[PDB]
Ligand binder design. Structure first.
Ligand SMILES: OC[C@@H]1O[C@@H](OC[C@@H]2O[C@@H](O)[C@H](O)[C@H]2O)[C@H](O)[C@H]1O
Ligand SMILES: [Ca+2]
Length: 415
């Protein structure tokens, strides 16, 4: 007799996994029916923004931690603190503190106070390598703890780049990294960032940032350890990694089901190569599961969010279906130590969460438009048509104006 709308995003395997777990929820709560609105990851932001613009908000939905403050100011998210406190034996204290705290807001700052969402997951973005490829080539395996230097990384990528079937054409490459998701680690491990410590000034014109961005573009254009521009257009590097054509490619826990189904070679996880700091860097993603401020059924809505985030049965089903690592810290630690579950070094995921992972810069700002503008016009750098130095000088004032507006608009919306 109760109906909830649950809006979310995922790759195909994730959609299937969450749809299955929602059916489990419906079995446990036969009086609640959940109507699903699901999109691809790239389509999600536009569809959720449209729902919010029309004040027709789904009862339960994924959202970006960087939107928390804005969503609170516009009364989008219900304060679910009391519903969670009164809930049957769930203890958020077993859940990653870093995850829980992204969705707390005390009226002034994120990280403390009332709960406005529950963590879907934490998403450490690790580096994978193709072990089959290394062993066929006779190249010593990467170390599981000590990062390659950038020069060492290029050296091995060059050794992996070859014509394996002897037809005269390269058909295997060291890597093929997507700047949207992998530039951050090179920037951060080189002691740079998109914005300063105060999170109010754009710093992409830092020589350290420029060096990292130029090195990144140089993998394709100068060192030539990737498929060509045309080859990547023909078949993107994610697909080429699945087919066993690339030595290195990132791995997130959300990839594991897809990789189980499609990857036939052996692969394992390693630290990212490190720049001038000598310390590896990468990001830890997260999404929140929120409840509409306007929902007619707040108890049931929070029960669904809890079932996906913290309930041992709901969580076990998600982890079993290989679309995330456990939200419970103790369960995650035991998971990582189980050698029957691959990759062998899935401990690297926890090392990222605990030690060397960072947040996206937009998690700190009121909106992310300033950062989207950096990426919007980045491709000529990546394809060698414009230098990193020339681009960041051009982009910086456009980014700064947008960041300044985010800062101001925060002041005006929180009155
Ligand atoms: O394109 C391959 C895909 O991109 C990387 O993941 C980035 C991002 O994170 C998830 O939340 C979204 O599904 C995805 O677009 C990974 O390399 C791979 O999943
Ligand atoms: Ca060939």
């Amino acid at each position: 007799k109760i109906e909830l709308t649950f809006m979310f995003r995922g790759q195909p395997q994730e959609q299937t996994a969450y749809k299955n777990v929602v059916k489990k929820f419906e079995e446990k709560h036969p009086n609640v029916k959940v109507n699903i609105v699901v999109t691809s990851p790239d389509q999600y932001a536009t569809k959720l923004r449209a729902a919010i613009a029309g004040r027709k908000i789904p009862d339960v939905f994924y959202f970006n931690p960087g939107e928390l403050r804005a969503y609170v100011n516009s009364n989008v998210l219900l304060d679910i603190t009391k519903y969670v406190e009164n809930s049957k034996g769930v203890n958020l204290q077993d859940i990653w503190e870093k995850g829980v705290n992204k969705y707390r807001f005390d009226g002034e700052k994120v990280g403390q106070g009332n709960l406005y969402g529950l963590p879907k997951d934490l998403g450490p973005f690790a580096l994978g390598y193709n072990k089959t490829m290394f062993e066929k080539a006779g190249i010593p395996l990467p170390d599981k703890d000590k990062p390659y230097t950038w020069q060492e990384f290029i050296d091995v990528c060059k050794k992996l780049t070859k014509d394996t079937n002897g037809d005269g054409k390269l058909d295997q490459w060291g890597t093929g990294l997507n700047a949207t998701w992998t530039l951050q680690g090179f920037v951060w491990s080189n002691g740079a960032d998109w914005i300063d410590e105060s999170k109010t000034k754009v710093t992409v014109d830092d020589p350290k940032f420029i060096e990292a961005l130029q090195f990144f573009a140089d993998m394709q254009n100068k060192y030539k350890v990737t498929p060509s521009i045309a080859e990547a257009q023909t078949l993107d590097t994610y697909q080429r990694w699945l087919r066993g054509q690339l030595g290195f490619f990132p791995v997130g826990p959300w990839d594991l089901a897809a990789f189980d189904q499609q990857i036939k070679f052996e692969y394992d996880l390693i630290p990212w190569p490190a720049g001038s700091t000598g310390k590896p860097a990468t990001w830890v993603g997260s999404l929140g599961i929120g409840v509409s401020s306007m929902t007619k059924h707040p108890k049931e809505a929070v029960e669904l969010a809890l079932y996906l985030s913290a309930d041992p049965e709901g969580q076990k089903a998600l982890v079993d279906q290989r679309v995330q690592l456990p939200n419970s810290v103790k369960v995650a630690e035991e998971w990582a130590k189980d050698p029957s579950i691959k990759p062998a070094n899935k401990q690297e995921f926890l090392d990222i969460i605990n030690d060397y992972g960072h947040s996206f810069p937009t998690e700190y700002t009121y909106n992310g438009e300033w950062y989207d503008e950096f990426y919007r016009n980045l491709q000529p750098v990546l394809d060698g048509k414009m230098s990193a130095e020339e681009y960041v000088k051009k982009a910086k004032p456009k980014m700064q104006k947008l960041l300044d507006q985010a800062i101001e608009q925060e002041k005006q919306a929180s009155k």
